[PDB]
Each structure stands twice: as structure tokens, then as C-alpha cells.
Amino acid sequence: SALTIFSVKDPQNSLWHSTNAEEIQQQLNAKGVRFERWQADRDLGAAPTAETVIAAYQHAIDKLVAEKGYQSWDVISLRADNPQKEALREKFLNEHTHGEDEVRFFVEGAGLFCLHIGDEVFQVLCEKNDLISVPAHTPHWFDMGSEPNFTAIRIFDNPEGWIAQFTGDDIASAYPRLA
Ligand code: NI
């Protein structure tokens, strides 16, 4: 798994470039970031739909949602045929912050990660069954630039729950393009 981190004053400058599985979590998790890795016990093979895949891990999230009983639960994954996929990540590109934690578990496909805490930025690029949770009140965004039908688990929340922006600047629009 790779992990790129840049400063806020200059993006072309990386203050921490490395690819470790443990040294990665220790870096972000050291900043209050969540980390974990779940796997299936049965042998998977021809899985055309994730509906069956999530059911194999639902038990795991079934415990997380049980306490944080969110309003609803669903997964984000459309077909690369939808032309609004790029427009969808755009409206989400705007920076923001939710009053609750934003748990994101990856099930298939690779995307991009962006955790902004204090004056620094974090960019993770690796698709493992591992997930990362963002704390409530932490500035962050989300961009899937190239999306080939990615399978991920997201929670359903209302807007009045999160605020649009704190300063109004869009720094996220800086790394919105994937690869
Ligand atoms: Ni968010």
C-alpha cells in the first residue's frame, strides 16, 4: 500500500513518501485515524454483485452500525457507463465536515484518500479490505477521478448533519484528479 503526504503551502513537496502497511497506519492512526483489516473465511470466486460480498462482511459492520445506528446504510458503486459519475464526485469535491465519524470501507476498485488534520494533508492510495474512519469535525473531502465501478460501504446521513465549508476555500479541488 502506498501513502503520499504533502504540505499545505506547497503540494509538489512531499514531507513523507513511503509504502508500508504497518508504518502507514501508525502514521495516520498516530494522528487519531482509524485502521483495520477484515477478510472472509469462505472461498470467493465469481462475484458479479457485491450485494453478496457485503453480506459476507455485514456481520462486521453490523457491530459498528449497531452502536452508531446511522439513519441508513448503503454502498457507493455505479457502472462506469453512468456519465454523471464524474459530476457526482465533483459536488462532493467541496470540502466539509460532519458532526459524526465518516467510516469508509473499501470492498472493490481503487480510489483516493484525503485526511486534512491541523495544518497538513494526508493522501493514501491502496485498495485493501482495510478501512479508514474520519473523526467528526475534521476537514476532509472525497474524489474518485477515475472510477471503473468501485465497491465501497458508506453510511446515509442528512446535510444539516454536516456543514458545507469552514473558510469557503476549496483545497480539495487541488487533488481531485486520480492518477
Ligand atoms: Ni465527508
Summarize the entry for a quick read.
This protein has 179 residues and is of the alpha+beta class.
Topology of helices and strands:
Elements: E1 2-6, E2 14-18, H1 22-30, H2 50-68, E3 72-76, H3 84-93, E4 97-98, E5 102-108, E6 115-116, E7 121-125, E8 131-134, E9 151-156, E10 162-163
Antiparallel strand pairs: 1-2, 1-7, 3-9, 4-10, 5-8, 5-9, 6-7
The protein binds nickel (II) ion.
Protein name: Acireductone dioxygenase
GO biological process, one term: L-methionine salvage from methylthioadenosine
Binding site for Ni(2+): 96, 98, 102, 140
Q: Label the CATH architecture.
A: Sandwich
Helix content: 10-25%
Query: What fold name goes in the CATH topology slot?
Result: Jelly Rolls
The ligands found in this model are: nickel (II) ion
Shape: globular
* Structural class label: alpha+beta
Alpha-carbon distance between the two ends? 15 Å
Strand content: 15-25%
CATH homologous superfamily - what is it?
Jelly Rolls
Largest beta sheet: strand ordering: 2-1-7-6
Level-1 CATH class name: Mainly Beta
* Number of domain units: 1
- Number of helices in the DSSP assignment: 3
Rg over C-alpha atoms, rounded to the nearest angstrom: 16 Å
The strand count comes to 10
Report the biggest beta sheet as strand number plus sense, adding barrel if it closes: 4 strands, antiparallel
Order of helices and strands: EEHHEHEEEEEEE
